[PDB]
Amino acid sequence: NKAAVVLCMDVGFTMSNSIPGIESPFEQAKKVITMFVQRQVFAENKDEIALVLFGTDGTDNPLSGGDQYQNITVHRHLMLPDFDLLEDIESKIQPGSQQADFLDALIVSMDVIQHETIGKKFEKRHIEIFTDLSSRFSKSQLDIIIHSLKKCDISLQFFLPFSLPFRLGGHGFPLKGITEQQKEGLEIVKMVMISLEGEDGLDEIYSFSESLRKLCVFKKIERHSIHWPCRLTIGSNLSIRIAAYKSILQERVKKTWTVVDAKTLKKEDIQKETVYCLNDDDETEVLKEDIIQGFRYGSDIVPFDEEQMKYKSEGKCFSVLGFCKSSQVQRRFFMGNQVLKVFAARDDEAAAVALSSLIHALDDLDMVAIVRYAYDKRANPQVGVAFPHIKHNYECLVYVQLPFMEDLRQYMFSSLKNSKKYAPTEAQLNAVDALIDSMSLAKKDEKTDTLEDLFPTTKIPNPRFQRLFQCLLHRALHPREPLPPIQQHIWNMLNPPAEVTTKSQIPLSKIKTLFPLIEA
Amino acid sequence: RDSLIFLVDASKAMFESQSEDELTPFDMSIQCIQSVYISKIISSDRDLLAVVFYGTEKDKNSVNFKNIYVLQELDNPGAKRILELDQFKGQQGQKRFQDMMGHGSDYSLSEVLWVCANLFSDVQFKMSHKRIMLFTNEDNPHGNDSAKASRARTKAGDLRDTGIFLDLMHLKKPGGFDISLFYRDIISIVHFEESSKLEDLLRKVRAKETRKRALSRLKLKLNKDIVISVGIYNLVQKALKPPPIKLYRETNEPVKTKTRTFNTSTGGLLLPSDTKRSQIYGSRQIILEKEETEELKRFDDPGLMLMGFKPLVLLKKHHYLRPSLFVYPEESLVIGSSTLFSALLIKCLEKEVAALCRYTPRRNIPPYFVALVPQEEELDDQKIQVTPPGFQLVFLPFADDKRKMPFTEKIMATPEQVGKMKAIVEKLRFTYRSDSFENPVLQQHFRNLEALALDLMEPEQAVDLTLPKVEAMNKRLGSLVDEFKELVYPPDYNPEGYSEEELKTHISKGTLGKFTVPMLKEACRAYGLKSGLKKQELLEALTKHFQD
């Protein structure tokens, strides 16, 4: 329900070091940080955010008593994020001249949580550190640091200038090209994360650039989705208690644009008045008292013992109709705007086993279940598929709605294979065969017998929001200036690796010549 | 508006069932027509339909031609029209037809072709398509009158020139139905098989009752320049329950709805430039011109930008986001496309790879990465095209569309259980086909709506096919149920009522040596193993305690 997040940002001198063409660590961190705060603000989440800074020229923090935890500043204490925080990140806050002890910052960051959460109720306390691990630090605190993080249940994440031509946010620095100090800091970071989450913990160390094309900064604070309880039934004598979760559901712009007066900028003054009148000439006006409804039925017009003739459903359900070869239920038929994952009711070992049987039973015979789905009593029944999905950590059925006959639009199309008019030449075929090879967005790399996606579009966030948020913000801070251009790192993440573009050139050229194309 | 004339052969053969528990070709024909009528009404389509029989005894056509009866002229589908056609369904309806327009009569297709060609002219609207669908189980109508047979071929040839197209819904006849004896030089342009069952006839009719309608046409740019035009089609589209319309209570007439916004204080009607856009976040108001609300969505210009090719394996079935579209070449805009497109479809199929593109429908809309999955053509036994050739445009979700899920512990079933479930799965096997179920609600709605438009006593409560045939499933399952429960449900079940791991990892990752000595002690204290005062000691120990 609520999360307390501390953004511990390195602002030290080396953060400003700028290599020709490449944004400096400070500028990248500033970008990632703003991406986080923007989201929290325009989304209206009530997660509280504190911002710590280490490397500031001065010292402003609760633990500074005695020339300690120096150059660490708690720029912002725990509290909802507002535009005043955003404006502080762009303008106000700038790069420092000093180099604070990175673990000291962490401790100060931990202290903000600990003390400032007492009177409140948070479900998750999380800390995000952005730094280049460029300077010295005392390992002496590690002891207390770890143990406290564990006892207090504060989770952690690190964002660095590298990973474990440069395009910010693209899909393209040797651990040899980093300083030795950086290497030493990284070992302590790597350790700390291993002690907190083990192996997987290493996946909590990101690079600023990859963070722009991921939602990883929001990972530890996403609001779990509630389950749907129901009985998967086979016949009227077999019953299995299940729980369904929206696995896939398109995220949409939530807030809407309110129409206001160009000057008062108020809504009250504005009012839409929808009136009715005779459609054909002699356009007389009509009165509500004198207006009925009714539906069309071809040329017929029926004024619609009436509503009382609406479909009557037995209500909520998830009953099996039958099973069948998976191959017969083709993906091109999938419909609806969601994907449900069905599991056995929580803490019901019996059901767990019951469902497991079914799941494996389907994966084996290579079949699937055609089922009737009904969310609640008022819901319109559905017919869809439930197919097995087995993994390392769990097992379940993926439900996806199928079509009703009236949804089918069957148009015939001319075979292009048997077309003597269009059949491509051998010169043309190999030409394309060449292109496809060059534009491969995958590679049988590393674990030799393994395939690696080079362009995981489903790991990229919808460029829709960051765009919108950017604009919204730019208007809040710069009311007079016109909306800004899309940010490069957003364009860079929506484009494929540079390799692909390169390898494609020549092939494409040949394909240009070999395939004539002229507009009618 | 598209026009469609349904031409039905009323010869005596058409009323003889081919010795099966199947219907007579006439009956099939009639019923497939009531279907197309009802189909059009459901999708609220504005197409024009007509009904014409030939080879009848009586006649009714503009120029009193003989043996030709025009039951219904080109017009929109209505309750009464369907009711009328329905009066000729079934055996009893066959008599009704026989009596009214006695079958088995002389005739000549030219005269018939003319009447239909004529029903079009009479139309007072503009028509996007002019087709005639001929239902006949007679393959060589004028094989004995080498003159009529000639007028008919000519007359047909003329219709094509006028833009009128005829499709042959040939029905079964003893011995088969040779298309090459006549209709060969008559139909417009392998061909469909002869229909002997109402099931295949409808499938054949449905496959031609409508004409290709693209959702749009876009530039599928392989790069800035190399571009081909394609048509985007939506083969699947949730059929909605049309909303009611408002009527002038006295004349039950449609009523347009104007919408006028205005300033309340000055009573003045507002123009688009007298209002700006707003959104508030806390104590912060943000104002943008309407032009800007749209400006901030603009990325690519409309089209399909190629991003590369990815092995179909990486595309996941459970990664569904929204219905898929169909991509076919649009030779009309950019000539040569059908070729480039065809090559791609051929190579993507060979390489089992889909083409990844940044899709943008209309202007000002965020892009979406989609997968153009290669799709091979497929025809069934009746030569009906089940799956067209081209590309399945598949939407891929953005990170925001994925909702991750926490898990409890995995509790797997035993091979004996999977066994019993497998058995159950097979007893309930069946062949799924996309046209299997009708929408319960839509049916109910329109069925009632019909009954009412026909001042009928009451409506026809449809039969929900989407419901599970319980008694059946039960019977077919036998003891398997009770035998399955035994394997999984305890007899008293409420069916309806520095841990070793960590440290072992630090060693593998070489981070143990980065431990402070206090951390090292506590660790050795926990395994109460013989330690030291030095770090290397504690280090050697702990490592040895695990690995050595």
Side-chain angles (χ1 to χ4, degrees), chain A, chain B residues 1-127 129-548:
Chain A
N1 192 284
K2 236 208 298 175
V5 198
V6 172
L7 304 177
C8 184
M9 173 186 205
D10 187 312
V11 291
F13 185 67
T14 53
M15 282 297 289
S16 311
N17 280 21
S18 53
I19 287 172
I22 310 164
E23 246 162 292
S24 65
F26 177 78
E27 286 296 81
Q28 285 183 43
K30 201 176 161 191
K31 286 194 174 192
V32 168
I33 283 169
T34 301
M35 180 195 176
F36 183 78
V37 184
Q38 287 189 326
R39 166 71 70 184
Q40 297 301 121
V41 168
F42 305 117
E44 311 217 72
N45 306 312
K46 310 301 160 175
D47 299 297
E48 304 192 15
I49 309 164
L51 166 58
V52 181
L53 307 180
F54 54 109
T56 57
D57 282 331
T59 303
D60 192 345
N61 87 68
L63 317 183
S64 61
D67 303 32
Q68 317 195 72
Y69 301 98
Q70 296 285 298
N71 304 288
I72 292 170
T73 298
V74 177
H75 179 84
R76 175 78 146 231
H77 292 270
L78 258 201
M79 58 174 86
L80 298 178
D82 43 54
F83 299 87
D84 277 16
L85 178 72
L86 294 162
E87 197 188 49
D88 281 17
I89 306 299
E90 303 202 318
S91 207
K92 199 168 178 185
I93 306 178
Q94 290 168 62
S97 304
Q98 304 301 289
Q99 299 278 31
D101 175 311
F102 115 74
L103 283 186
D104 265 355
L106 189 47
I107 284 181
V108 184
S109 288
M110 288 190 264
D111 190 80
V112 151
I113 285 180
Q114 293 176 306
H115 180 284
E116 293 173 45
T117 55
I118 304 170
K120 314 185 179 179
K121 182 229 172 180
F122 292 108
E123 190 186 291
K124 301 174 169 299
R125 309 100 220 157
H126 184 55
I127 290 165
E128 284 169 36
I129 307 85
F130 312 70
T131 173
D132 59 358
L133 303 164
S134 97
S135 312
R136 298 181 251 92
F137 58 88
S138 169
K139 293 189 186 187
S140 68
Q141 301 313 300
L142 285 181
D143 193 39
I144 301 182
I145 304 167
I146 298 179
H147 194 288
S148 277
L149 285 173
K150 296 197 177 172
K151 294 298 170 162
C152 294
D153 196 46
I154 310 180
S155 74
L156 212 50
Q157 284 195 303
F158 288 80
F159 301 75
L160 315 165
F162 46 82
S163 293
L164 284 186
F166 182 73
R167 302 273 148 155
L168 194 58
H171 304 276
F173 312 64
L175 292 202
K176 178 186 174 181
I178 69 183
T179 84
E180 278 299 302
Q181 180 68 61
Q182 290 186 304
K183 288 190 185 177
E184 192 204 312
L186 187 52
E187 289 300 297
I188 296 299
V189 177
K190 284 202 301 176
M191 168 191 107
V192 182
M193 291 308 305
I194 281 162
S195 311
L196 291 185
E197 290 178 38
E199 199 181 312
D200 318 287
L202 292 180
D203 303 59
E204 293 321 325
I205 307 172
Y206 311 79
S207 82
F208 298 137
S209 184
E210 51 176 339
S211 283
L212 290 172
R213 60 194 182 60
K214 292 173 167 149
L215 294 172
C216 66
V217 294
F218 311 109
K219 191 167 189 178
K220 293 296 177 169
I221 63 168
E222 299 264 36
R223 307 154 163 175
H224 184 282
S225 188
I226 304 295
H227 73 294
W228 181 72
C230 195
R231 282 174 206 161
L232 182 169
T233 69
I234 301 179
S236 69
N237 288 304
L238 181 41
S239 193
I240 309 176
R241 299 213 323 152
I242 55 167
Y245 304 78
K246 288 189 184 172
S247 168
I248 308 294
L249 171 75
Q250 175 177 291
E251 183 71 304
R252 301 181 179 173
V253 172
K254 69 155 192 173
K255 211 126 178 174
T256 193
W257 289 104
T258 303
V259 178
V260 293
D261 176 277
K263 318 180 186 187
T264 35
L265 298 171
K266 299 298 183 184
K267 185 176 184 172
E268 278 55 50
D269 310 28
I270 319 302
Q271 200 179 304
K272 303 196 293 189
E273 198 178 67
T274 168
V275 189
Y276 320 73
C277 60
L278 304 179
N279 190 42
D280 206 299
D281 261 53
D282 314 325
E283 180 185 307
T284 322
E285 173 178 50
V286 190
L287 295 182
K288 168 187 181 175
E289 266 208 62
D290 300 298
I291 275 187
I292 52 177
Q293 314 185 317
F295 311 80
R296 302 190 58 87
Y297 189 72
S299 67
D300 296 338
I301 275 170
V302 208
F304 213 4
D305 297 297
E306 308 207 313
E307 287 346 308
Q308 354 188 311
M309 299 201 269
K310 171 186 172 174
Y311 176 72
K312 283 190 168 180
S313 76
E314 288 103 302
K316 184 184 191 178
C317 85
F318 194 92
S319 26
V320 182
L321 289 188
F323 305 76
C324 63
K325 301 194 176 190
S326 171
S327 47
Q328 315 192 318
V329 170
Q330 290 167 60
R331 159 163 212 171
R332 57 164 185 137
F333 293 151
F334 288 178
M335 283 186 63
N337 295 284
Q338 78 182 343
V339 174
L340 301 182
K341 277 191 185 181
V342 185
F343 302 80
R346 190 176 170 180
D347 310 313
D348 191 322
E349 206 156 356
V353 173
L355 199 72
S356 197
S357 317
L358 221 203
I359 287 175
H360 283 280
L362 299 177
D363 170 66
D364 271 58
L365 309 144
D366 183 58
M367 306 191 90
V368 286
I370 299 301
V371 309
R372 169 187 218 270
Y373 177 77
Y375 188 64
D376 55 39
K377 167 161 199 154
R378 194 181 193 170
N380 278 317
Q382 271 167 50
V383 170
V385 54
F387 54 93
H389 184 59
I390 309 162
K391 288 307 163 197
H392 178 296
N393 308 270
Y394 63 87
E395 314 189 308
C396 72
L397 297 170
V398 180
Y399 169 78
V400 191
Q401 167 165 39
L402 287 176
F404 276 133
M405 172 244 125
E406 309 82 341
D407 301 322
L408 299 181
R409 289 190 191 181
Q410 327 198 62
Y411 300 155
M412 315 205 305
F413 287 72
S414 306
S415 282
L416 292 168
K417 185 182 182 180
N418 317 314
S419 166
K420 303 311 165 193
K421 306 180 175 177
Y422 300 111
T425 67
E426 186 58 38
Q428 292 182 307
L429 287 181
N430 307 307
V432 162
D433 183 296
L435 180 61
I436 292 177
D437 275 321
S438 56
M439 295 215 274
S440 174
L441 297 179
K443 182 196 175 181
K444 304 183 178 184
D445 190 68
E446 187 136 56
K447 299 171 185 172
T448 54
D449 333 306
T450 285
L451 193 61
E452 297 289 42
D453 190 318
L454 310 178
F455 198 54
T457 55
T458 67
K459 292 205 169 190
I460 303 175
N462 200 317
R464 169 155 209 160
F465 313 101
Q466 289 170 290
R467 171 41 168 173
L468 172 69
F469 293 164
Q470 179 210 31
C471 292
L472 279 179
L473 188 47
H474 193 276
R475 185 66 101 214
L477 305 192
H478 312 105
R480 290 179 172 178
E481 297 175 53
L483 292 180
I486 300 176
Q487 302 162 280
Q488 259 305 130
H489 72 86
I490 289 195
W491 272 127
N492 291 330
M493 72 176 204
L494 299 169
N495 297 310
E499 312 179 349
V500 176
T501 317
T502 286
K503 296 194 173 180
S504 73
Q505 294 308 307
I506 294 172
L508 293 181
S509 61
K510 292 179 180 176
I511 289 197
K512 185 164 188 177
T513 60
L514 289 185
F515 292 74
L517 295 159
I518 180 170
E519 301 202 62
Chain B
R1 271 188 164 170
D2 297 26
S3 283
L4 183 61
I5 293 169
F6 289 110
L7 191 54
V8 176
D9 189 331
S11 289
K12 199 177 177 190
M14 296 283 285
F15 297 92
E16 309 176 324
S17 185
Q18 276 78 65
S19 42
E20 313 147 63
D21 277 301
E22 186 59 59
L23 304 173
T24 49
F26 178 84
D27 209 5
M28 290 194 292
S29 293
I30 292 291
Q31 281 171 52
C32 281
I33 291 167
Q34 302 197 70
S35 287
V36 188
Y37 273 55
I38 302 192
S39 255
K40 299 291 184 185
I41 295 183
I42 301 313
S43 77
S44 15
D45 216 309
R46 315 193 162 193
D47 304 320
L48 297 184
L49 308 168
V51 174
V52 186
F53 306 91
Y54 69 94
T56 63
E57 197 218 67
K58 289 190 186 175
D59 61 283
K60 179 188 178 198
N61 52 75
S62 60
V63 309
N64 272 49
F65 260 157
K66 299 172 175 186
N67 304 104
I68 301 165
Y69 199 97
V70 171
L71 185 71
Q72 311 186 325
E73 296 158 62
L74 280 167
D75 192 24
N76 294 302
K80 297 175 189 172
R81 285 201 158 194
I82 297 175
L83 172 73
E84 178 166 51
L85 281 173
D86 191 46
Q87 295 306 289
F88 299 145
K89 175 187 175 183
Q91 200 205 303
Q92 305 190 320
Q94 203 200 75
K95 304 155 189 172
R96 261 168 291 177
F97 180 85
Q98 303 266 316
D99 299 307
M100 187 178 304
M101 313 162 228
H103 63 311
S105 297
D106 192 64
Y107 69 71
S108 80
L109 289 189
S110 10
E111 312 223 323
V112 170
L113 277 199
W114 188 93
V115 183
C116 299
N118 192 252
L119 297 176
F120 285 123
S121 306
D122 205 32
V123 84
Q124 53 276 66
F125 313 71
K126 296 179 187 178
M127 312 169 293
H129 282 94
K130 290 174 160 190
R131 319 209 89 185
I132 301 171
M133 201 175 276
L134 171 49
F135 287 79
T136 183
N137 75 330
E138 174 60 62
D139 64 349
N140 179 41
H142 293 144
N144 57 161
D145 199 296
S146 45
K148 296 190 197 168
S150 356
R151 276 180 284 135
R153 292 176 308 198
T154 297
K155 190 54 187 173
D158 293 306
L159 290 195
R160 307 165 195 164
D161 303 318
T162 284
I164 296 182
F165 294 41
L166 176 147
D167 296 299
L168 166 61
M169 294 306 102
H170 51 318
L171 309 184
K172 186 175 192 167
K173 203 188 187 189
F177 183 112
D178 191 313
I179 294 186
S180 72
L181 312 183
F182 182 52
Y183 290 97
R184 169 182 196 145
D185 312 293
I186 285 186
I187 62 184
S188 301
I189 47 182
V190 286
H191 196 289
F192 280 19
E193 289 301 324
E194 62 179 288
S195 299
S196 71
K197 299 175 175 180
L198 180 41
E199 337 186 312
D200 306 311
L201 184 49
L202 239 186
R203 295 178 178 166
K204 292 168 185 171
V205 181
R206 285 170 181 164
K208 290 203 165 181
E209 75 167 62
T210 297
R211 305 74 182 180
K212 279 205 237 174
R213 300 189 193 186
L215 189 55
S216 70
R217 299 173 177 184
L218 306 170
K219 301 176 187 177
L220 182 173
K221 310 169 191 156
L222 288 201
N223 74 23
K224 290 243 173 182
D225 239 288
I226 313 180
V227 174
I228 84 183
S229 70
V230 302
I232 301 292
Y233 309 78
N234 54 318
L235 305 184
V236 301
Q237 185 58 47
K238 189 178 165 193
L240 293 176
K241 180 175 177 178
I245 305 183
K246 285 158 187 172
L247 311 163
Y248 188 68
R249 155 166 295 191
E250 286 170 49
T251 64
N252 294 303
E253 165 186 53
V255 179
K256 172 64 178 184
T257 304
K258 288 194 176 188
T259 290
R260 288 190 197 175
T261 295
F262 48 57
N263 182 294
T264 293
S265 55
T266 66
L269 189 50
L270 293 175
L271 294 185
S273 69
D274 286 304
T275 54
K276 297 176 180 181
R277 298 297 167 264
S278 167
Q279 290 195 339
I280 302 179
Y281 300 77
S283 64
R284 196 59 168 250
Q285 191 188 341
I286 303 175
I287 310 294
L288 300 213
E289 303 303 315
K290 181 190 174 185
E291 311 196 300
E292 295 173 308
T293 64
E294 301 324 304
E295 183 206 319
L296 53 63
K297 300 182 186 178
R298 187 183 166 199
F299 283 70
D300 295 354
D301 288 325
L304 285 156
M305 303 178 68
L306 184 50
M307 302 296 290
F309 307 73
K310 183 177 295 188
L312 299 180
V313 189
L314 300 173
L315 304 182
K316 294 179 174 189
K317 199 176 180 192
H318 51 269
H319 261 23
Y320 170 75
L321 174 90
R322 72 170 293 301
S324 291
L325 294 170
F326 186 66
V327 185
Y328 198 75
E330 187 65 315
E331 197 64 42
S332 70
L333 310 191
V334 171
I335 297 174
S337 308
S338 299
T339 292
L340 218 189
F341 182 115
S342 185
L344 278 156
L345 182 58
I346 293 175
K347 283 304 179 185
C348 287
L349 283 162
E350 278 187 3
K351 299 183 161 185
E352 292 191 290
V353 104
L356 185 46
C357 316
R358 215 162 67 205
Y359 176 75
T360 305
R362 47 187 185 172
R363 320 256 158 185
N364 313 308
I365 288 181
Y368 240 94
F369 289 107
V370 308
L372 297 209
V373 178
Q375 176 178 301
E376 199 172 311
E377 166 170 296
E378 169 162 39
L379 301 184
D380 68 2
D381 71 342
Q382 311 284 318
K383 303 298 179 186
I384 298 182
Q385 182 175 63
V386 170
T387 319
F391 289 91
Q392 195 202 320
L393 186 163
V394 177
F395 295 77
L396 303 171
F398 277 113
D400 315 58
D401 306 315
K402 282 183 179 172
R403 262 63 170 180
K404 187 172 185 181
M405 288 175 300
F407 48 90
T408 25
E409 277 187 60
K410 178 168 177 168
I411 298 179
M412 220 141 79
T414 70
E416 195 186 327
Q417 301 167 327
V418 171
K420 276 286 174 176
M421 193 40 82
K422 282 193 194 175
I424 298 191
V425 167
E426 310 204 57
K427 302 300 168 169
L428 309 165
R429 203 186 205 89
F430 87 72
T431 308
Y432 171 80
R433 130 187 232 83
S434 62
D435 81 350
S436 297
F437 318 80
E438 293 186 323
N439 179 322
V441 179
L442 287 177
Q443 289 314 315
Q444 190 51 40
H445 181 69
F446 290 102
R447 198 78 305 107
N448 282 299
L449 222 44
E450 201 194 320
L452 288 197
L454 290 176
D455 219 61
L456 259 187
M457 301 167 269
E458 78 159 69
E460 176 190 7
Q461 313 312 308
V463 185
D464 210 326
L465 328 169
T466 75
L467 283 189
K469 303 161 177 177
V470 172
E471 305 314 333
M473 294 170 74
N474 289 5
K475 177 160 183 166
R476 190 144 223 291
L477 281 176
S479 67
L480 288 176
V481 154
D482 278 351
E483 309 184 312
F484 174 73
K485 288 182 186 174
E486 282 305 301
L487 294 173
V488 303
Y489 290 163
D492 66 328
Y493 184 62
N494 296 16
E496 314 178 298
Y498 310 78
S499 288
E500 316 195 318
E501 310 183 306
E502 196 196 323
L503 294 164
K504 184 182 179 181
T505 317
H506 282 288
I507 298 179
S508 172
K509 300 297 187 173
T511 64
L512 184 75
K514 304 303 179 175
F515 263 47
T516 60
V517 305
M519 300 179 62
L520 288 172
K521 286 188 163 187
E522 302 288 8
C524 287
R525 301 186 198 181
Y527 297 65
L529 64 172
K530 313 186 178 194
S531 58
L533 322 164
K534 313 174 176 176
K535 179 185 176 183
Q536 188 47 39
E537 289 192 305
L538 297 180
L539 254 166
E540 301 168 331
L542 284 181
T543 302
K544 180 192 178 178
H545 188 281
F546 292 59
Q547 152 78 29
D548 234 357

